[PDB]
Design a protein around this ligand. Sequence first.
Ligand SMILES: NCc1ccc(C(F)(F)F)cc1
Ligand SMILES: NCc1ccc(C(F)(F)F)cc1
Length: 330
Amino acid sequence: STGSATTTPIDSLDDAYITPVQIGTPAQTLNLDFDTGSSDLWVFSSETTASEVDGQTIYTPSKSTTAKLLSGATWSISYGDGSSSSGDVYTDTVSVGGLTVTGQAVESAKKVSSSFTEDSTIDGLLGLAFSTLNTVSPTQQKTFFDNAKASLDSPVFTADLGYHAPGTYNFGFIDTTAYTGSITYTAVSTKQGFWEWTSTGYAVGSGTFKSTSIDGIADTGTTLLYLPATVVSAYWAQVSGAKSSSSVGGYVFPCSATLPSFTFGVGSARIVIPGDYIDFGPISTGSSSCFGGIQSSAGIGINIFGDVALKAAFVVFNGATTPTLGFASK
Ligand SMILES: NCc1ccc(C(F)(F)F)cc1
Ligand SMILES: NCc1ccc(C(F)(F)F)cc1
């Protein structure tokens, strides 16, 4: 079996993407953020403190004839940006784009941090990293992908994110009309639970390609591109008037500048991020300083190929027993 679902940016800056997901019987449709950097499926629900809910669609287990409380199970998660949430655990039927899993763990939020409460368009997260990162205690739970793997035609899913436009998550098959050229595959380390790989280098604009190993994670759940300070400094040095701002918390640049492209290496292939993808617009309304989409990973501890990078490619997440990541131009 296969599944296919359209994914839509939540705002005009592509800050995040939501995908409709059917939970329960009869279906309750929620718009979830598909996150290859985490491994919990959690949702706003009828159990969430009512003051922490501001326009989200909520899952109501009491209206689902297939929902079962997972007795004694709890969950608690903290994200790399300081976000957090926690609650209890149901099992229920979950369908994405025609692909159905029964007995999926649905983590029901009793408490959510303020940054989820303010994002009215995101009803929850659907984690697609490896199940070793799932936070359910005492019995760890499997991801939607891990539960579906058995019945998929091929144990893969693909991410085709759009630039200021809808895109597609496909489960179980590779759409060979959605990319150009060949897919280059590269090895994944699952040792920290992430889709972790090693990029073979970079170039700024039409500069020379610098061969250098950059280890990092493919994370659809992270908006920007976070790279080592030496790389990020070499990129912004080509933008007249760009500077790192401690009050803003990253590199900013004059909104009137044109940004160079950024190339990253996948084995011997090259993925080019157009300069326009790196503009995240004014730091505040009316400002002439704009926020950069490539920032340093020094304060984070790991390099993150987030949406800025992934939306420049067709990306295959191959969850074969030896996992790999595939990249193609599109
Ligand atoms: N998108 C999920 C996520 C968030 C933060 C991190 C960090 F910061 F721990 F690397 C990894 C994955
Ligand atoms: N990387 C996971 C993640 C995804 C979204 C959010 C936000 F934007 F909803 F706060 C926080 C953390």
